[model samples]
Target: SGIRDQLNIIVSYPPTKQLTYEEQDLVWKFRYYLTNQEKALTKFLKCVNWDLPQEAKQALELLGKWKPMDVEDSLELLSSHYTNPTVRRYAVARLRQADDEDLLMYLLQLVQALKYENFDDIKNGLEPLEQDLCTFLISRACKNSTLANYLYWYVIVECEDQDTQQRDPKTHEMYLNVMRRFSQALLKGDKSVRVMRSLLAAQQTFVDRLVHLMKAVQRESGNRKKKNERLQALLGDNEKMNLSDVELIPLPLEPQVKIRGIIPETATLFKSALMPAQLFFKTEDGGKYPVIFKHGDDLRQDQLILQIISLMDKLLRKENLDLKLTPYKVLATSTKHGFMQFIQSVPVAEVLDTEGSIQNFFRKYAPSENGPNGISAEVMDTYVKSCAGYCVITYILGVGDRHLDNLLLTKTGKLFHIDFGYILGRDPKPLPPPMKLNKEMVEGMGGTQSEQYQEFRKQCYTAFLHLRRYSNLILNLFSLMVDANIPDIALEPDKTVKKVQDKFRLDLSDEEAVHYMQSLIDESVHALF
Candidate 1:
């Protein structure tokens, strides 16, 4: 209502009396009207104000013609207690843009005011954000210490942690969250990926189990719903069902039917039985090459590859007690009779399941009582989804071996690579599909990741990304190579054979591997929670 009085002032007062000298000077510089009230800055702002609906329409319509006049004074006015709410918000954003240090300081002082802005209040400027903007904001919020400190404390202190005992009672829980994230970031300064990778791996397993439960519900509906119309409408007719407020897939009222996932042993067999698609590493000279283990007296290629496997054996065999990796591991074939081609025959049974099959785990953790399996959202969001893929590649490059036996996924959604047989520091030809997947790494989402064979490709794709993300993981993994100077490759006796006994864990049957991978999936839902 006060805006009405301001509009009357703009309508009658001479523009010279209303605008500050700086604003007037600015207007003059643009060759705009200098004295007329009709051309005043106040007149322009009053038009866009919500209090004057017709004026707001007219101003927007005018903006469509020539540009709406710049209201430089609006920046200062926006922070004013008197400014209209919408205009005040616009002013704050403009002030942030204009580099108003004083306003930024003021914002810090009134921290509580902006912490819980209503969604509708900032809809146009902030809600349902574009990815680029969201990313930029996250970067800024993380990078700026001052902003982070205030935001961290304020969020915890004010956000609702309400229960019946203390309804609407305020607490500092939001600040606690901020401190936790900040402390985590500080602690993991450089090797953040290492931590992120483990969390993601655990989450992947958690989701696998959840999905299995959902499938059981789907099947039960077929039998139970058929006998009752109301039940049929709830589970049968997709179009007629009401899901507006439904969140997690409700558990079936009937016996909690359990579904058998893809067999862990079968997945291991598929991984081992099927030959690896050959190495496509390309040499620097523009020629693509396949990686192979060959005996060369002059080249020492065999000895070098052997040594790499030995190192991997040691790494895998270690008390991987707390580390997020698999115990199941590689067994390098003897050099004399071993295949000289890139990634040769995979022994169906030797492919071996870990404590659990990865495929089954996907179904296992897919979803349960409260929305998407928590681990899926937490670990994946905390780190990029591609973290698992990156870790595998690192392990492979280290050993220069992509041996089928080297990779393993546990029943609990754990992922690890076991063997390292090939030699490295050589040129890349047909090189593991360039060690990266496009942004669609979240493919096969909605838990419809298909059967075991289908998931195998996804695993490989993820493995590809893992290898290329880290430089050192890339370097050390290859340094064990015999040498890059020679045209021919030759020998070294590896220490790896001695280490194999310690790492292998999880030896599930074919049925187990299938179930493990299947468990990773979740029934489809709207993208946003």
Candidate 2:
């Protein structure tokens, strides 16, 4: 009779709710019976008291005998919720079954999952899951040069992070160990190692010289031409800017493109408040790849924000919904510095100031007789879709401090935002809108009554609905990052996950959620402040 009651409780328990201690005990007692229920595996694993030797042994035995989970479920097991080393090891073992291409897709998140591993167990002379993961990654990386390239940079980025090193020395040491193992395996031939070292040396030199040049230009008290002359004079001094052509190397910021050489003469300081240096590299195909190198401001937040955007873009695309998101690459080499993939685009503020309006700007760039506001239909469609995409994504993320300047537009009509200084409802401005939908943006869509505007709202609703389906994965990602040293996230560590969960509105049905988003868009469009 007790077994019947326990089985009924286990079967009827809500999957979304956390199990109470009594329910957890009941589940643990009946774990053997639930082993065949694949859906109950996560719950079963959660209920096991790993500190108890008997319970731990039984759990491991069961896991060993069970069938492997799919890649998605395995990844979920790596989240903060499942802290058992055996569970994480099982997840990694299942991950090994994925192909190289699939592994590459989740490589970034896997690296982030390293932080959730219990590295302290190593100090007690125990084999931690972190070592297993690192070994697996290094072995795969050695077989594939592309994976090796990304793994090297990702690990080195963490190794060079001073904040993490100081905050958690053990985790930092684990990263260093991974890098050491990777370098040793990949450097059996000394030539590649030599070239890679020189490339890194050149990057450091380039950044130092560029920062020096920017400082000299900032010190100049003359007009634009005087600043130009100072920059030219500085560039002529080879002793000051000792940047030269190095061996073909993949840029750390965007590893897909290999750079043959750097053109120091093309380095220029942007006329912005922070004066980030813009430098160009010659690609193998004789094309130029531009990058923005900035100092003095921590880019970890931007890096985190862009990483999530890229992940979301992939998630949406997997479901056959393309939102035309430009999740441009960003890599923070250190706490106060990083590189950004420079896209050729003009800011909405600049276009509004120079061309009078977005419509006029679009007309000047992508003009056609058969489209709205004399813009090509394809470009207009891209604009509407991309605008709708960002509007919904930004609102959900609580990305604040939105203005005309940070809103950028490509000539191809793709709209994207930059400068994620504010997130998780931490806006500097008073009474910011739910999302940045202004008169100018709606005007570019041919006013509020136009078909394009209606299409924009439709896409917003669909995107929101689709993303809601992946709310668990998204929340798990954020929960794993609560302890990260990012400025905004660290401010309210306890509330970060709750803040994101509230955005998903999982309590509401699909119909009600869409109506709620529609109201938000309506309110955003009419917001005055």
Candidate 3:
């Protein structure tokens, strides 16, 4: 009835005509929910007498619960005040989700934010000690600092090799020009600083490295004929004909970690079918940390969703429920790139490929009857338990687009989920399960009749119940992100929230909720089998 009322209101809204602000008030009164959240926001602003600050505040507050696309501009208007506390942080957050057409500007805003500490407030107002602290950080950073570390990483490091491959020549120039402008700005700022000989030395080191890398690429570009001759000799005629153009593999010029200082060692690059670019960092002490960088249209949507679930996992840990998700660190930069540090793990599919069968896989990896792989049963237990954790949260969150390719397992028997492009009741297939528990995943726990499989079920049920305690907290978090421009959620914000709400089943008793969850697990099992 509540949903119908909302839909009817949308349908009766004068058959697809944009109503004036004055007339909208007459059409929508008292009710807050709407099928079209943008219209709801417009009505909301008028309800508050067109008070810009109040409108911004309400919009942010309602963001996690409503659907609206115009909030970016509204938040921008709110941020124009700059002095207003309510919309200041939110405006920055919304700007991060700005359109691709405006992506360059949003990214530049991040650079400008780091550079001018209090530039926004300088034009406006602020405190004595607060302003002094800002000035101090700005002076040290803006003068002979690692600001270039971030600038280069933002444009060059975070993006994939193919990121520039298909771009227009003019578009390609825009990127180079952006880098040039940022470098020029920093150099101009450095002119006023004094007694900076050591600082200047470090700056020169980076410049030298950058030039060396550029020269190496130029040299590679010139060796095309020689490279082709070598390739043809190596492959012979038939194989040579099948080969594609081979691009030069270059090492990282001066790889910079966010906030952390740059690693002076030129990080080596590797290739992967599943990844765009993989970078391997060899430390002075002989330690290697491989990082995989991803660039997608959805930008930081995966990172953001993972972050929220990580928080949920943390909250569950307090109550003795450990989903043990392999929460690899994610860094979301600008609107185009997100960097994920590659965890050492083999895909579950790899295990399937080698083992010949699922049962054999369990025997091979599980400690007791552990065959060629001498992996511990404890590790296998952790893997199954983590799968239980993955199933529960993903089910509750309505995560979709699940397949074996996205599910990975480490040698330690650690299981984790990745690539959250489709989620929140949005699915690529028709009538997908509330959770995805595939045949291989179920068989991994020693089949439905095995003790381990029963244990997996128990863990899933307990995790579901454990999360209920913090249902509102989780929902409220999602509600706050309602304005986040996430893929499927952006399409239907109201239904998305409702989908999560239904999963909570907050109206039911604890026993009833457990039964409902059991039924869902049964459904998933039957579908898998």
Candidate 4:
């Protein structure tokens, strides 16, 4: 009845059409959708072949006109208070590419302004640190700062091999000296003084090693072919793994500890990690695969979703796909609190209040023929056990956020998940019981609630069952962590986590913590559907 009423209200809303249509058109033009989740994706085709539109054409023209886009104009617009945050960040990305002297002076002024920023502006900001870091890196890189010069060198060396043709003698010398100074300053670890002791030490090491390495890499006079060949050999390839003759003969090692992301502690909330190292793999060849690692933020949606599907197939006994993550070494995990951070966004509100919320979703379902809950009996009987298993996983890893946004479907009927920065913790917010199956949700059109509508309860348990298997694999992961002498983070967790819990008025113990979380779907999922 509650859902039906809402549905009717929605249907009767005439003005909603105009508002939604305008919003949607803006959304389509600016992006494929208008929600806060525009990750700068969806403008291009999913596959190789895709069609273009007038907006896309116009966007391309603007891009061409701008050529190397300027961020100063857009960045200034952002601070005026009306410019959008997302747009501001987008402009910052562009500004990073430009190195005009004007930008350097402007950034120096910005540093001064930041030092005097009000407390309110400091605390109630949207990832102010992130924006600052991005800007700082860009500013330095754009200028003649040795820091930027060396950062570029690292990029070149790490990205390619030796003998890949040098830029310029002056630039190369500048790169070496700048790196020497930065390394020294970094190693000193002093904010009070600009230390460069370590930088000098490192330069000595580089010079010492360069002499031998360069000679080994060169065979003397006019053997340019051999030089090019050796240089090419050093540029290691990822796809080259599949073609290697030696073959990755697993040395009795299992990769259950393959990661997908990372988590860091901040203001009592443990941030989630998104890396291939933490996630599980699906096959032999899939082990030890490289993930596109961004220093901050979660993995791309497609990357995350694909892993979810891969794990589901293996855990649920489903068919395998052409591409799936399978670890080279399986980790025997330990018992600990794992988390499932539920990350969401709603920047339409106050900038500080703008989304990035990781909250619990607690809503119930209507009764159906299968039972009072709108879940079918067959699904309950055959699949409920999976949910119970998921509960076990939740208990072991302290998994939270078992919601819809993080879970996804692949185009080829595969399931996957990611954004793991939330493991090894408990829910901060208090929540209610397991949500019952909502009948109206599955009912086609506006019809009466009955067994005919479809089962919601049954599907969740099924998802859990899939999760349980993942939990078991994760347990294997912990064992490896212990063996590798990785810090026993589970046992000696951050002390302040409990303080946050106490402030939140939580009376539950570690045991209750385990039990209450599982109650939502474990038993019903395990025994009665």
Candidate 5:
């Protein structure tokens, strides 16, 4: 179990000669007996050409048999030093494919060992990962919630915050930038609690539902298999049940929230053929609120856009604008579902005549004289201003999926937009103008020729100018999101920033930017009949 064992295998076969299967067996049997396993394993892994399938197959088999500690030690040695590229690649792949606690433990250990101090001295010595393997490592790391959470903190604590103490600025920045890239990739596919789904998705499963399902699938079987047996059965049958091999476990299949609090007053469900049904809620204090719950299909892009627009509204409020935006609060979020605060609001379709123009909507809902709804002229003025404000921001945001149905008006006269399924210069309509100001909207403000109509345009200009002042803040918020998997943005993260930047025209003087905005408004206002 010492140098004699190593020599028995090495001295017998010259290092220059190809090893036979018989010689390989002797080497494996004696590997545990060697003084330095890393040295022994490295020699064995490269004994045959790495490109050979048989050699790779054998190496992988041996690695599969290795103890967790040995596997970790070998990984450190291979990664820290100049090992064969093929061996390094295979080692990374093997770790990624690991489906046990070993992978998690190894990751935590690796992260805890990170030393950003004296970082510059070894920054260049660190090997850059191949893009494909880097992606795989991130994906694997994201599989376990605990591992992802720990690594997330490890990076943040070490790099993101320097408030408590200052480290090497340039060197830490280098580490910071690299770690940020890794964190972003890890989050994009993370399996933790960051995902927020709508209420409908959250209520998808219940113990009642599960009982019903178990009853439905009732079959006589051996008195319920042991827990491990059940897990093993599931693990084995998963290959058949899940056609999408990537998604092994069904997510959000059960209720993530307790039903004791915030009980709904009404059992009636508001249904939507295209979207999640809106649900009502009553808190412990008899307070009522409507909630919109949904699954995050596109990196929660809708949520982010809503937050951004809400940010714009807060900015307007801080800048001391008289207008108000009904940016409802977001409640709780899990990877599978999200909860949002809601209010009593009706769509533009509710107030409009079936075949009438936008003029008809104002005539019915916001008439100068008393209407059936008894809306006051003052209320109409508020509505008009709200419409103008929304139009300016929506145009700047390039919010797509704009139709009468999504343009909702509150009873108090706040017009707001919803269903942000697309944004940042992406749209379903071809060659649509920058803004969506149809004749109905123009006519709603008492006609384009009226004083009230002119006020709408002036207010729009005022809001646009105010928003321009904070363009830097807005762009920076989105720049942090460049790594987010939001739909339109992920497709073109660089262009996403550029698209918003283009709207601001930061290079142009504020005067020119205002002119540019006005021209866009004018073109949109007169684009069609």
Candidate 6:
């Protein structure tokens, strides 16, 4: 039978392996035989050359008969570069089966994927994939107050994006329309909506007061005590800014944890270029949550980077590869303002300046009775694992502007990066290396000749191999955001996808990739700048 011919061609090949053009054609011709194979779904999707009308028609028919895909695979399809409306619609239909919690995890990226949706169809009164996505999101957001709160900000951020307004006004209008529709649905009979509005207004008012206080404090040139007294007096002068006993409200950065109110007395301005305000929010359970609130700087880029980091952390955790990543929450309330979760940590520069080396720093903070370098064995493990994890992640994301000042370390030995001003291979400094593994970090691992260093390399290899398994998913996510107006991504929109794809180096086998990564680490260690 003709079915036998199709099976013979494809059965000999691995289900997940890339198929030849002839094999793909045969699979497309008789996709019915392979519809039940879950592993074959992505392969089949790849086989259809969507550019051909007849081929696309046949693919659509086969997709209609195919069983629902898993949420992961469906997300992959949605992230793909394929412009076929029917294919993406099928993917969204599968996503409809996802629960609210799962949907929330990918909500940020899903909102960005709106750029991939067809706006013309929606404008023409036709049911398009954009409508499907918006409808699904709005319905789920309506039931969950937390989801609704985040969705409102995410959509409004897009609606107000300055780059989109000038470069692609039509898309900007589309986002506005979606926001208007979403507001109507989300605000009906919900007092929480009003509370959220008040909280945001209060946040703005608080920032204004802090700016005023900062200006007043900066004008005086005196010792620490004088500045402290001046700050207290200014704070006392403005009674409205005192949020010591305000009602409980959900934090904009993290909605799950409600705060009693802000502690105005704890507001301290950093000496950095932007002078970001760091303050503590009094939590309901008598705990203090520190947050950094900033104005006059665009935080959308940082927000996007952290969201991707959080997603990657989830992906790694799902595979049982916990890198101990500290993807702190970030929320850009507007183009020039936002909030960031503040982790109590010192920058690498301070550690180096005080202790002369990271090893001594660790020794001082997490010393052990008889462990290596007088540091706790467990803490050393944490340091090496986190260092390897971040090295691989930063390299893959092409994160730039990495220096001692931005690389921070916690007392418990967790390492994390901040200041995502440059990404996707756009570095202000010339000849930036692929990763930021310096001699100091290696020395912290008990020198390059130590077992810890070997373990670090092994971990780097393992993490890279594990993440590469989902290369398609990661690539698709970036592809969906090519038009997103993030500063770094916007710099070279056309090359954004390729920039990330090249880092994956899919052409190399696992063995080859390990060697490639080894060379990258070696080169990064010796790079001058």
- Alpha carbon lDDT of each predicted model: 0.31, 0.76, 0.52, 0.30, 0.52, 0.77
Best-performing candidate as measured by TM-score: 2
Residue-level lDDT of model 5, residues 300-348, one tens digit each, is 5665676677768877877888666766544223333455556677777
Task: Tally clashes: model 5.
Answer: 10
Of 1 and 4, which scores higher on TM-score? Answer: 4
How do the residues 326-357 of candidate 6 rate in per-residue lDDT, one tens digit apiece? Answer: 89999887776778999999999999999899
Estimate candidate 2's alpha-carbon lDDT, on a 0 to 1 scale.
0.76
- For candidate 6, the clash count comes to 0
TM-score for each model: 0.21, 0.86, 0.56, 0.23, 0.51, 0.85
What's the true lDDT of residue 241 in model 6? 51
Ten-residue region with minimum lDDT total, candidate 2: 121-130
- Please write out the lDDT profile of model 3 over residues 1-529, one tens digit for every residue: 4655644453333111235664555434543545254545433433343356666565556644656434224332221123434334443444445443333213322432322123343323222222221232233334433433334544442232243336433334444444444444445564543223334334334334333332333343334444333322322322222111111111122223211222223232333322233444443344555655444333456755666676667767879777678766555543554457677776677778898544566566565644323345677678778988888878887788887778888766678888888888777988877768888877776677877777888888788888877664455445444433466766886555567777877768789988988888888788765
Please give the lDDT score at residue 277 for candidate 3.
Answer: 39
Q: Which sections of candidate 6 miss by over 4 Å?
A: 1-30, 37-57, 76-85, 118-131, 189-239, 526-529
lDDT, candidate 2, at 9 = 54
How would the candidate models be sorted by TM-score, starting from the highest?
A: 2, 6, 3, 5, 4, 1
> What is the Å distance of residue 285 in model 6 from its true position?
2.2
Displacement of the residue 265 alpha carbon in candidate 2, Å: 3.5
Q: What TM-score, to 2 decimals, does candidate 2 have?
A: 0.86
TM-score of 5: 0.51
lDDT of 2 at 92: 80
Query: Which lDDT tens digits does candidate 1 get at residues 29-112?
Result: 432332233235444453244566775555444433433233333322322222344444443433344332333223222233
Q: Residue 345 in model 5: shift from native, Å?
A: 2.1
Stretches of candidate 5 off by over 4 Å are 1-265, 295-299, 330-336, 354-375
- Model 2 misplaced regions, further than 4 Å: 1-17, 22-34, 37-39, 80-83, 99-109, 118-131, 188-244
What does each candidate score in C-alpha RMSD? Answer: 28.4, 4.0, 11.9, 23.7, 22.0, 4.5
